[PDB]
Symmetry: C3
Subunit: 191 residues, 3 copies
Amino acid sequence: HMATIHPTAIVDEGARIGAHSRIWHWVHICGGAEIGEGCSLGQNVFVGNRVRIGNRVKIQNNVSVYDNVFLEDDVFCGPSMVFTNVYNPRAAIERKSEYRDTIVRQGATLGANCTVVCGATIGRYAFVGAGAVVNKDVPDFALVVGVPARQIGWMSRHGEQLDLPLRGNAEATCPHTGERYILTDGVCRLA
Amino acid sequence: GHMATIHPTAIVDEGARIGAHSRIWHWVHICGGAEIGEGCSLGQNVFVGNRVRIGNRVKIQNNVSVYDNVFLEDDVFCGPSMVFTNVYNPRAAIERKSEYRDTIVRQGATLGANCTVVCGATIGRYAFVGAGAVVNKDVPDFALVVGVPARQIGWMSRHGEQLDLPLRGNAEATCPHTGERYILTDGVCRLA
Amino acid sequence: ATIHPTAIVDEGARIGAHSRIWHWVHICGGAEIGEGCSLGQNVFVGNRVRIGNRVKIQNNVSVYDNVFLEDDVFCGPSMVFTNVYNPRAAIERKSEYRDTIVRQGATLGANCTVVCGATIGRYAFVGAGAVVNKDVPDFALVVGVPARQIGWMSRHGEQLDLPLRGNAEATCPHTGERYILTDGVCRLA
Ligand SMILES: CC(C)(COP(=O)(O)OP(=O)(O)OC[C@H]1O[C@@H](n2cnc3c(N)ncnc32)[C@H](O)[C@@H]1OP(=O)(O)O)[C@@H](O)C(=O)NCCC(=O)NCCS
Ligand SMILES: CC(C)(COP(=O)(O)OP(=O)(O)OC[C@H]1O[C@@H](n2cnc3c(N)ncnc32)[C@H](O)[C@@H]1OP(=O)(O)O)[C@@H](O)C(=O)NCCC(=O)NCCS
Ligand SMILES: CC(C)(COP(=O)(O)OP(=O)(O)OC[C@H]1O[C@@H](n2cnc3c(N)ncnc32)[C@H](O)[C@@H]1OP(=O)(O)O)[C@@H](O)C(=O)NCCC(=O)NCCS
Ligand SMILES: CC(=O)N[C@H]1[C@@H](OP(=O)(O)OP(=O)(O)OC[C@H]2O[C@@H](n3ccc(=O)[nH]c3=O)[C@H](O)[C@@H]2O)O[C@H](C(=O)O)[C@@H](O)[C@@H]1N
Ligand SMILES: CC(=O)N[C@H]1[C@@H](OP(=O)(O)OP(=O)(O)OC[C@H]2O[C@@H](n3ccc(=O)[nH]c3=O)[C@H](O)[C@@H]2O)O[C@H](C(=O)O)[C@@H](O)[C@@H]1N
Ligand SMILES: CC(=O)N[C@H]1[C@@H](OP(=O)(O)OP(=O)(O)OC[C@H]2O[C@@H](n3ccc(=O)[nH]c3=O)[C@H](O)[C@@H]2O)O[C@H](C(=O)O)[C@@H](O)[C@@H]1N
Ligand code: NA
């Protein structure tokens, strides 16, 4: 049941990778990293030391999970999406002491080639469209697109838009499962 | 010296079909189901899935992952770190391997550096997707599209320069490099 | 320079003291890299490339032929350079490369893209994800697709209290250094 690791991958002494996880070609994981069970890390992923990745997190090719990135259970990182840890980098000024956290909450989907400016929290089951640039917190269930990203709707856990306004108070059901969502002052939650 | 073939660091899985005179560079991984034509170039860290067909003289720059259900015709150009997809609405907790949508890129299309194509879109012959655009709808033959999301702003000749053609209606234009004539018919561009 | 054993640095490449080359980097034999640089995972460097001193290049950056990086340039993770403006696979355009010159202290944010031909000014700052397709003035802060200027960044890397255009003066509070905006061009006084 131990994690399976491609022979071309480099997992540095000390790293913790949970059962049933799968680590693919030319992945490098630093020794501080903690990765849960049933994760998948695609070709050329990088993982830093100051990183916690939960269970069943699927990370596509070419994603660098840097120090100060935290991924909850069931997060999806699409191909070539990009995390950061310094807000205002300058090569002349080492900013390793100024890292900002990026927290991605359970079930959030980070679309292909999106970018997340450090300091943002991405809420539970949020959905960041392909290519978006996130530079503010993303509410639970929010669908955001564009550069920079702006909220255009709400996404059910299953991954389809809810017939719910952005603002105010309202209720709606998932078009697939029928489960109910409540909007209260512009914040969406599961009933 | 000798012509480069397949860099020794590449991994080409048993079964892959690669045409003559193609060049596969450092730390490329090609899956066993893939078919790749003649005269192609695959840059550093390319990935190619199993359910993939790539034509002839397809030039793929570094860091492009040609996933299952992407199909590239002859003379397609994939710019550095452009991005294909195959699931429209991914959720880690919901496996969607039976829900892949095709991305078909027709002959001569150019996909600019760091663009992204949302699966399901078809990219027309000799289309031109500007650097960093995000394509989420079909792109007509010859269309020049830019932006997030991508919008059509012009028409690009086979040579790769804008044609003096309006976006809609009927019109004609000539490429000054080749003298090739183009006809627009109710907003659809073709070579004469 | 210190070079990870998985990196491939082709014979002829010049790499200065105190530089660090990380996992599965490939550097071509014509490249010139200065002192105190850092090249992250899977970086690629072409032959017709000059990279100055103390240039920090994060993972997944391809520094292609005709890209020139001055000292103290920062290239963020997965940012993207180009060298052909209008590529077509059928038409080899290796003779038509356009230069991309990135001047001293400029920062290229994560996952930005620079269309070849642009010059990026000294201490400019290209926001994460921007697509640059025009020259970026010294100290300009630009964001968006395509990139548009929204302010001015000090060397330290925080916005200066200057109008977007016009004539004005400002001081960096971290260093006390003075900036002068003359006819929309910012400089150190
Ligand atoms: C967000 C997404 C799921 C579409 O959701 P949807 O509910 O079907 O939304 P629609 O297509 O109706 O689009 C709604 C609006 O948002 C815009 N939009 C949708 N996705 C967008 C994106 N990624 N970037 C910018 N705008 C986008 C649409 O253009 C439309 O606006 P318009 O009418 O002004 O043109 C899809 O576009 C997307 O980004 N998928 C991600 C695919 C991916 O990253 N997969 C990775 C795994 S392989
Ligand atoms: C599209 C491209 C070829 C320019 O074509 P062009 O016919 O010269 O067009 P122009 O530069 O006149 O631009 C026309 C409009 O489109 C905009 N535009 C052009 N390219 C754009 C891009 N990639 N993204 C967003 N907008 C863009 C321009 O800003 C201009 O708009 P504006 O007048 O409102 O500012 C070029 O910008 C590009 O994207 N090249 C791709 C380079 C590449 O990917 N190379 C990879 C191989 S190394
Ligand atoms: C540019 C940046 C430094 C913010 O600078 P700032 O002076 O704090 O600017 P603000 O956040 O006040 O933003 C000012 C405006 O520009 C917009 N903006 C800021 N950064 C943006 C970006 N990258 N793309 C698009 N828009 C952006 C903001 O949304 C705001 O406009 P709005 O009011 O319409 O929303 C930051 O967003 C950024 O891009 N950092 C780069 C991180 C990176 O690449 N790190 C790499 C090393 S790990
Ligand atoms: C990766 C990281 O967090 N980078 C931040 C950092 O940059 P940098 O150029 O100094 O790099 P870097 O820490 O040396 O690592 C470079 C590469 O070496 C590899 N690397 C490095 C160390 C290690 O122990 N293992 C390893 O694999 C691994 O491949 C790694 O990617 O400081 C910058 C800053 O000051 O603003 C921040 O903006 C950056 N986000
Ligand atoms: C690659 C791919 O098509 N991913 C889709 C997929 O995700 P995932 O995390 O389950 O991955 P994955 O199939 O295990 O392959 C991961 C990596 O392992 C390597 N890989 C994998 C298998 C193989 O035979 N060879 C190989 O190299 C190779 O490097 C590969 O990149 O299911 C998602 C979903 O359900 O929504 C879809 O959104 C994703 N687009
Ligand atoms: C990389 C580069 O500058 N590409 C430009 C080029 O495309 P292309 O497909 O012909 O490639 P390429 O020169 O064969 O190199 C491909 C890969 O082989 C590797 N490579 C290649 C040669 C070499 O000596 N060493 C090496 O590592 C290395 O990994 C390299 O990335 O001609 C196009 C064009 O005509 O418009 C331009 O738009 C492209 N910007
Ligand atoms: Na990218």
